[PDB]
């Protein structure tokens, strides 16, 4: 996976066509001087612009894009799909792709939808048309077929940096995403900060247990780590002893990655009441 | 103040009469071998027993006591009254000492009463008879007079380690006690962990601001510090910069005391979801 955000703001791969099939080539960011976004407005490489023509998302749009009057287009990047975004699917009406429950909200975000469905004990949450939230446990949310991820790019009504599906198009998420806690026993998975992909709420204490029977060690990486405060903190505890193995906060970041020689770890997050930020994504991989 | 707990479990002063006036002298704990409590059952000085006859509370009774068939008695120790316990007062009925609101609860504790009143925006909370909670903003809760603190020693129905008043006797607390947050501007005050004097709840994030216009420094001491986990933590932040000045947790305790050369500090507490403990009491004293 090359993206651990919902809008691929963290994408830093080398796709430079709007689509791998039938796409247009991207312009170079160090020559797009007519346009708002180019390397001269953003020295220091902010949002990943540089001396290339690779798809990027520097302005908080819903997906990566590039300059190509249609002077820019979204890129359809298959590897850029955060873990837990299960895809964009067609919704032909009756029955719907998820059959559990639904609501509409003028402030819908991915997480407010996810959160609504999770509450009600549903496995899957789907957003359509920017404002409609569908929940379900149905395994066959793909019933009407997959759609290009670009057909799910309506802005969420509550957050314009986030995609919320489309007309007859539903963007699907596992409701574990951004839960405040959870048990993980898979060989490898990703854990997101609470409320992800919204910024994390103030005053959260959340922990997740990672227990992989038979592991000799577990490898941790933090492909996303955007925690604001010395007071916000992410901690890994030894599961058996509760000893704090590592403490990360806004002023002491994680190495690319590191290994813990345990089969049982507890990841804790504490959020203060000062400033919120995008949060984190931790990828763990157990090794036998 | 010689006690920062509600039952004086932390009292370590030298009173060895049950009362300073008309009292009986206490027996020595290193010769009370008939009794459950003595220095041979508790080597390592637990609950402050040693080679003395000083009032102590090693068994989680509601107040300090000593051996003197009435073979033991509570001690009436004027200095042992935690900051925010405003005293024990007479209640002669109509009108009551606090006139705001009331409830009864089979699980009453000091904090559940305090919490109920605070919620409703009352300054004062009072417990009577072990089970009755009274709230009020009335300044004259002392209207019927003070009583010996020993007349307020009914066990709280929800916590037998805590006093909850008596028949016609009300024990009074400032509702700031154990609040999850607050602003302090006094020259000196005490801040307690959340839910104090109950053990702190799991999953709390609380902060209190101490801002004393014109202070050159603020002196902090921790006369009580009973935090269980490496994962629970108390932190002091610079108010202007939010820099974490000191981090204390279950495995790294505070010095007797220390000074911060600021007029503006934020005290933060984070409580994990593993084990709770009695909590803390921080005494600050600003200096000009
Ligand atoms: C895409 O970028 C690569 C550099 O990674 C470059 O070799 C190639 O010229 C690019 N293709 C197009 C059409 O820009
Ligand atoms: C921008 O950078 C590319 C890749 O190095 C370079 O080939 C190109 O000529 C540059 N264009 C300008 C206007 O700097
Ligand atoms: C972590 O785990 C693997 C063994 O599975 C090891 O080969 C690799 O070098 C380790 N990485 C670090 C940073 O220790
Ligand atoms: C009280 O204890 C003090 C020691 O601090 C001792 O001098 C004195 O003998 C005691 N008085 C009584 C009656 O025990
Ligand atoms: C206990 O300690 C006191 C104070 O030191 C001492 O005077 C007394 O004789 C001791 N009694 C016994 C039985 O050890
Ligand atoms: C703290 O403050 C006072 C000045 O008000 C100073 O005299 C005292 O020595 C200080 N204590 C510590 C531990 O610095
Ligand atoms: Ca924060
Ligand atoms: Ca704890």
Numbering used by the authors:
A (entry chain A), B (entry chain A): 30 to 97, 103 to 322
Task: Please give sentences taken from the publication describing this entry.
Kremen 1 and 2 have been identified as co-receptors for Dickkopf (Dkk) proteins, hallmark secreted antagonists of canonical Wnt signaling. Mechanistically it is thought that, in the presence of Dkk, Krm forms a ternary complex with Lrp6, which is then rapidly endocytosed. KRM1ECD emerges as a rigid molecule with tight interactions stabilizing a triangular arrangement of its Kringle, WSC, and CUB structural domains.
We solved the structure of KRM1ECD in three crystal forms at 1.9, 2.8, and 3.2 Å resolution. The high-resolution structure is a near full-length model. The KR, WSC, and CUB are arranged in a roughly triangular fashion with tight interactions between all three domains. The KRM1 structure reveals the fold of the WSC domain for the first time. The structure is best described as a sandwich of a β1-β5-β3-β4-β2 antiparallel β sheet and a single α helix. The structure is also rich in loops and is stabilized by four disulfide bridges (C122-C186, C147-C167, C151-C169, C190-C198). In crystal form I, a calcium ion is present at the canonical position (Gaboriaud et al., 2011) coordinated by the carboxylates of D263, D266 (bidentate), and D306, as well as the carbonyl of N309 and a water molecule. The coordination sphere deviates significantly from perfectly octahedral (not shown). The F207S mutation recently found to cause ectodermal dysplasia in Palestinian families (Issa et al., 2016) maps to the hydrophobic core of the protein at the interface of the three subdomains.
